[PDB]
Amino acid sequence: TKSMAKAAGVKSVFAVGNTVYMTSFGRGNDAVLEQKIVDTSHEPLNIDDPAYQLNVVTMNGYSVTGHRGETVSAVTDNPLRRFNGRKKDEPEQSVPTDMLCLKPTLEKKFFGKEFDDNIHIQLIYNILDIEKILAVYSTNAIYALNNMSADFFMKRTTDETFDDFEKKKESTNSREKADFDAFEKFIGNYRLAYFADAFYVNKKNAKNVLREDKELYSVLTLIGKLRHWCVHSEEGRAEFWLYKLDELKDDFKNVLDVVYNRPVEEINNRFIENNKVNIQILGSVYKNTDIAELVRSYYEFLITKKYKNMGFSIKKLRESMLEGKGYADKEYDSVRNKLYQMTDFILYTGYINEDSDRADDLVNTLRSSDDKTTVYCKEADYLWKKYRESIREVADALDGDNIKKLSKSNIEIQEDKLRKCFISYADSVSEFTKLIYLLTRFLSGKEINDLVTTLINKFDNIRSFLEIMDELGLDRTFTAEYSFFEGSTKYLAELVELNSFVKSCSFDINAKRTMYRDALDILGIENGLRNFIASNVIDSNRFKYLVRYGNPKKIRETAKCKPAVRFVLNEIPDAQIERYYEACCPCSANKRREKLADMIAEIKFENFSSEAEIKRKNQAIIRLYLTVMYIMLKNLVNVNARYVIAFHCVERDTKLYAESGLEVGNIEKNKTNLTMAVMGVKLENGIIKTEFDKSFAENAANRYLRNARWYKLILDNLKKSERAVVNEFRNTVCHLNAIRNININIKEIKEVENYFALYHYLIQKHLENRFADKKVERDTGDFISKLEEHKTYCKDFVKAYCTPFGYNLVRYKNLTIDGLFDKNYPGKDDS
RNA sequence: CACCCGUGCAAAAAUGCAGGGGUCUAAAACUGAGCGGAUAACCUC
RNA sequence: AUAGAGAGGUGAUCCG
Ligand SMILES: [Mg+2]
């Protein structure tokens, strides 16, 4: 269940020295200081509108009741008593540390000094989360540019201007000429038609053509170094690269500007023309406000998407206040779409113009409160009794073409302003945001939303912590290398602006004559009907993902692996399966899937042979085959993203512990060194000769491995691991070779229980293929033998090569025990 | 059906009841996840 | 000269 303390409004419980501070929820993510406690003595800080009050205060707990929404009573634990409770021989009361014991080093890196409080560590961890998510969504981008090859993108740095790169053409060193020849080969690929916004430009003659060679190199280099910086841990001045993007060479800035300006120029030029009808009608019904200001407000409402960020579902509000009314009838379907939207502005302006005060009641009652529906019903009730006359007037203002059309050929505009208050061009947006947009040209669909939303959340959290620290009187002055975060408010605004217009995709150019072959190969076809299948397969949203992150001919072969297809169809609900079968073949639920899996695997041209039903049949078959293939590839890529997180964390924590004084060894040649440094064990003659003892458990470097049980399990697993196996596992995960060779690695599978099993079977088979020609250790040989015998992923083998993540117990258990892996498909623990 | 911590009852190294964790994990809370199911709309093939 | 289908924007709709 949700935390009762958060229901009462206790946002956070900070600790500063011998004092503990409690905060409440303000507007949005802002925080308001409420109470301060000094050893059972308390003095409230917010008096104008308290969110909660303390009833009984003891050294080991604080009791609250809350005043807003449901009066829910709750108890909060004193942060100063953490790790200092009963059975600990009554230790002193002190400020807590993070589980990795990296709080002193992390604070000394981002700030100049150690701090006696726990506010700064949360800001540092949010920055770490930003880097973590950038690693995931950057390693996927380079994979897209690697896939089209059917190396260069590694070790590509931003201190090499294209004026220098061209000199490499006649260079006598073969290792450099091969690097240049890789670039020459890359730009001639027809698959560069995909990711159009990053490599193609529009010009009059008008048609789309490739950019110049200079601009293409800048895009590849910028994305290339983003991966290298966000996966490796650079040494020297290069480690602050993302936070010092103002120092880039002129070529990289110009390409970023040109890429960023295209959508902002498209949208901002059509605003008046595309929305003229709505503006005039809204100004007719809202004539009390000046037209010049009023049209500016509508820019905030729709173009900037401000009306959806208010903290509650305005969609639900409108749905609940338009209950059972005649103007919403289907007989006005030609108006209903606009009637809702013009009602939405009437809704949005209310909580800003006049009734801004009482939006707090709605945003707080919902939080303190499933039974949350009646809150919407009550709130929607007042909405009608006030806005009935207003929205009914709009309901007839839109009536008839006499206004829905006369609003266009009137051709009257204010036209007086100099195009101000719009979305900013490239000259005003910071370089950090412009690099995010370039990264999003290569991701697809939900990934864009995930990345942008996560970035917005983390930056907002950083801003809230900074404001709290300003209120408390603490020092926040970042080090000179990290001045990037001082203006976090500015970077938040640009990302919120970006989320409004980012297209979540990049539409391909009008050169689909080349995509004909790929679209035919994805079905294994290779007259007249062929062009129809090509036209339908292309422009299907699920085909865009398949041809970017996969190879068309390889995808068809994996459709022949029956268990992989059968598992995907089981995830589709029973109602949907019935719909497909009704269209695909004009019975038992289980048997319906079996017949469907037979047809999707053996799809041929002959299967595609009045005419209306046959046209509809082929549309269903294409939609089904692409849907199944999209689901399997998406899940495998997302699972592989979980391990790039783990390896990024390993390579970051290695350097973090290096500064703390713990000897770690060279992480490159053996990736299990970090977990050996934490447990205080050292390799000797290639094996761990130190047996288990309770003394080593107590002297562990971090709190995770002070668990007596889990030290033994990890130590037992390290003995079974091998250096080469872990290195090849690292190489496979970061370059996504497990998905690149889905053609071979999935051939002999027997049963797929979840996407965890399917993913780890692909990696283990790849490891078998890689080491079949070389000597292996006895444990690896036993694991390979078990894999061959059972034809399913060996559970013990997973615990072997996932050992470099052992220093973080939670991450180790999540990435080695099935069921604890995915939060959407929970399962029982197996340890 | 993950990890850590506090508290109370039972126990010699541990069990249970009840809580907290933006400082545990992709993981604090407020717009139930939408990843499936298509309609009139301006414009495109 | 005329007739296809997916796109920024909203109803539909099932899921725990
Ligand atoms: Mg966190």
Side-chain angles (χ1 to χ4, degrees), chain A residues 552-590:
Chain A
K553 214 145 53 142
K554 284 182 191 133
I555 286 294
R556 180 51 177 87
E557 272 289 321
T558 87
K560 297 177 57 67
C561 155
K562 285 260 212 192
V565 162
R566 194 102 191 281
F567 176 62
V568 177
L569 291 177
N570 295 346
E571 294 297 310
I572 276 143
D574 208 308
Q576 279 267 346
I577 287 295
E578 180 162 59
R579 195 190 307 276
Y580 291 132
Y581 190 24
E582 284 215 38
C584 292
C585 303
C587 299
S588 170
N590 303 87

Side-chain angles (χ1 to χ4, degrees), chain A residues 272-536:
Chain A
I272 50 136
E273 301 280 24
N274 211 100
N275 308 19
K276 195 157 60 192
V277 43
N278 316 330
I279 299 303
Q280 264 325 117
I281 297 174
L282 181 285
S284 305
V285 300
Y286 223 89
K287 70 189 301 291
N288 193 51
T289 309
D290 189 13
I291 300 302
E293 177 72 15
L294 191 59
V295 66
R296 204 211 41 61
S297 304
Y298 208 91
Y299 198 102
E300 282 175 33
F301 158 80
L302 152 62
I303 313 296
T304 83
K305 304 283 173 60
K306 187 66 63 174
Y307 95 100
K308 294 189 178 184
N309 199 239
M310 327 197 311
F312 56 68
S313 182
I314 206 191
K315 170 169 164 51
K316 275 281 174 287
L317 254 287
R318 164 249 325 175
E319 284 174 357
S320 48
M321 52 76 88
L322 287 178
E323 45 96 45
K325 318 215 180 308
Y327 301 102
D329 287 346
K330 72 184 298 177
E331 74 179 18
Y332 305 114
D333 272 356
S334 311
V335 171
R336 280 203 307 121
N337 183 290
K338 312 301 293 322
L339 178 60
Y340 296 149
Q341 191 185 125
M342 202 138 296
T343 301
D344 279 359
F345 162 103
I346 294 318
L347 259 191
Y348 163 74
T349 188
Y351 307 91
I352 298 300
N353 204 344
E354 64 183 69
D355 256 337
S356 196
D357 49 355
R358 46 172 282 208
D360 290 334
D361 290 348
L362 176 64
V363 73
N364 288 278
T365 303
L366 186 59
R367 173 162 52 225
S368 302
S369 296
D370 304 3
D371 296 348
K372 291 182 293 183
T373 55
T374 172
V375 186
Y376 285 144
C377 317
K378 181 52 62 182
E379 176 69 10
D381 188 12
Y382 162 84
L383 218 55
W384 182 255
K385 351 183 171 74
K386 193 29 55 63
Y387 296 130
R388 174 259 294 186
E389 171 275 358
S390 305
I391 52 168
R392 198 222 66 73
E393 211 156 350
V394 174
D396 62 41
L398 296 163
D399 187 15
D401 226 332
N402 43 274
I403 297 172
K404 210 177 75 182
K405 154 44 211 83
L406 178 138
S407 57
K408 287 190 68 180
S409 192
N410 59 337
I411 320 177
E412 62 200 321
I413 314 97
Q414 64 290 320
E415 196 65 14
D416 78 321
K417 300 297 180 280
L418 67 169
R419 317 302 177 206
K420 63 163 60 181
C421 309
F422 295 163
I423 296 167
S424 54
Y425 289 127
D427 297 348
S428 306
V429 47
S430 67
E431 274 94 43
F432 166 69
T433 303
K434 301 190 295 221
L435 185 65
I436 288 154
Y437 186 82
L438 198 45
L439 178 62
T440 53
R441 314 270 49 77
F442 305 106
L443 321 182
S444 57
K446 299 199 66 154
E447 299 179 296
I448 320 287
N449 222 334
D450 182 39
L451 174 62
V452 181
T453 310
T454 303
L455 286 177
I456 290 168
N457 264 39
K458 302 301 171 175
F459 274 113
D460 208 10
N461 289 350
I462 294 163
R463 175 194 66 88
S464 72
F465 287 128
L466 289 170
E467 214 138 45
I468 279 289
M469 272 172 316
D470 187 21
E471 272 270 302
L472 271 163
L474 269 50
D475 191 4
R476 74 161 150 261
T477 311
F478 292 96
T479 37
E481 302 90 344
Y482 282 102
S483 55
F484 176 86
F485 293 109
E486 266 129 37
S488 187
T489 60
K490 190 169 70 25
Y491 293 99
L492 177 63
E494 280 139 336
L495 278 170
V496 173
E497 206 99 83
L498 183 140
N499 189 38
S500 74
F501 74 92
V502 61
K503 258 318 168 73
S504 192
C505 187
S506 162
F507 58 92
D508 319 336
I509 60 177
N510 284 300
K512 330 182 318 322
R513 300 302 43 60
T514 64
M515 315 193 181
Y516 187 94
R517 176 53 56 79
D518 273 28
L520 267 195
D521 267 19
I522 198 180
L523 292 164
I525 298 304
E526 299 277 47
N527 199 307
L529 175 62
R530 213 171 327 288
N531 329 86
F532 156 63
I533 319 150
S535 304
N536 190 3

Side-chain angles (χ1 to χ4, degrees), chain A residues 125-126 129 458:
Chain A
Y125 265 79
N126 280 270
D129 284 351
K458 302 301 171 175

